[PDB]
From a paper:
[name] shows the archetypal linear, flexible, multi-domain architecture evident among proteobacteria and retains the lipoyl, β-barrel and membrane-proximal domains that interact with the periplasmic domains of the inner membrane transporter. However, it lacks the α-hairpin domain shown to establish extensive coiled-coil interactions with the periplasmic entrance helices of the outer membrane-anchored TolC exit duct. The adaptor multidomain structure is conserved throughout proteobacteria, but primary sequence comparison in the spirochete [name] suggested that a tripartite MDR pump, BesABC, included an adaptor that appeared to lack an α-hairpin.
The crystal structure of the complete [name] protein was solved by SAD in three space groups, P212121 (2.35 Å resolution), [name] (2.5 Å) and C2 (2.6 Å), in which either a monomer (C2) or four intertwined head-to-tail monomers ([name] and P212121) are present in the asymmetric unit. The [name] monomer shows the archetypal, multidomain adaptor topology, with the MP, β-barrel, and lipoyl domains in linear arrangement (coloured orange, yellow and green, respectively). Density for this loop is visible only in the C2 monomer where it is stabilised by the loop of a neighbouring monomer in the crystal lattice, but high B-factors here and poorly defined density for the P212121 or [name] monomers indicate the small loop is highly flexible. In both the data-based assembly model of AcrAB-TolC and the in vitro co-crystal structure of an adaptor-transporter (CusBA) subcomplex tripartite pump assembly is facilitated by the flexibility of the adaptor’s serially-linked domains, which was confirmed by MD analysis of the closely related MexA. This ‘hinge’ flexibility at the inter-domain linkers is also evident in the [name] variant space groups which show movement of the lipoyl domain, relative to the other domains.
Residue numbers in the entry: 45 to 105, 114 to 317
């Protein structure tokens, strides 16, 4: 009797994705330029300060005033008290925190299957408090020829968006396909014999296994989504499978829970 561990298998969702990089940006924002030439006497702003359209944010040389062109928060200050500046010199950036946007550049071969409304995950770190849901908002019409990329825009949704701060780098996982209501199982359950693929199903009464042919629909992160003669709640060997054949007698050392029915991502 060969020792095996079996999974009580569940139907669920396995999802494919495209791995991108992007930046948290905002739709509504503006550069702050002076209205005359001269030197900076005072800066009446710090990062994070809220300012109103018209408000005086700095002072130049008489004293001349630099005003905010829109209402919002100060995102960056690119200028030092003491520096000389002119009407095309960027002193600081103002933007709204309620029009957040993720910008990314997708290579052309991937564009035709991306659609407004597609789901994405936005990641700034490894833990779930550092990940955020998003939807594709806009595909630019522009193809940049040198980079062979098209800009795609995502809008974050859901909770705790305070932690998606403007300016941040993010990894993006854009969902491209969902295989739904499929048996999911650890990949090592699948065994390749004579150019085909099988799993071993345990019969509890006879303490044996039956070798069932399967088709692997998709796999990622060591997880197979499969079709074939396998049903919810079948016991399928996930350790010891290499030593088995059809009808092999076994010893069920243990039974693991089925992989979650919810999406890998």
């Amino acid at each position: 009797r060969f020792p095996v561990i079996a999974m009580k298998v569940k139907k669920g969702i396995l999802s494919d994705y495209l791995s991108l990089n992007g930046d948290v940006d905002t739709k509504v924002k503006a550069d702050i330029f002076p209205d005359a030439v001269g030197k900076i006497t005072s800066l009446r702003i710090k990062l994070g300060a809220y300012v109103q359209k018209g408000q005086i944010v700095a002072t130049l040389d008489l004293k001349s005033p630099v005003r905010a062109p829109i209402s919002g928060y100060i995102l960056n200050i690119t200028k030092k008290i003491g520096e000389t500046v002119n009407p095309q010199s960027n002193i600081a950036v103002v933007g709204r925190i309620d029009t957040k946007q993720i910008l990314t550049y997708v290579s052309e071969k991937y564009i035709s299957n991306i659609k407004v409304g597609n789901d994405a995950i936005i990641e700034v770190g490894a833990y779930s408090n550092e990940k955020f849901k998003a939807k594709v908002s806009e595909i630019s019409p522009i193809l940049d020829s040198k980079s062979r990329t098209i800009e795609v825009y995502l809008t974050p949704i859901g909770s705790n968006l305070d932690k998606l701060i403007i300016g941040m780098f993010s990894k993006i996982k854009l969902i491209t396909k969902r295989f739904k209501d499929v048996i999911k199982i650890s990949r090592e359950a699948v065994v390749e014999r004579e150019g085909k693929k099988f799993v071993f199903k345990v019969d509890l009464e006879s303490k044996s296994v039956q070798m069932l042919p399967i088709t692997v629909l998709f796999e990622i992160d060591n997880i197979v989504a499969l079709s074939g003669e396998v049903e919810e709640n079948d016991l399928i060997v996930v350790e010891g499978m290499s030593a088995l054949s059809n009808g092999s007698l076994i010893n069920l050392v243990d039974t693991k829970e089925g992989l979650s029915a919810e999406s890998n991502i």
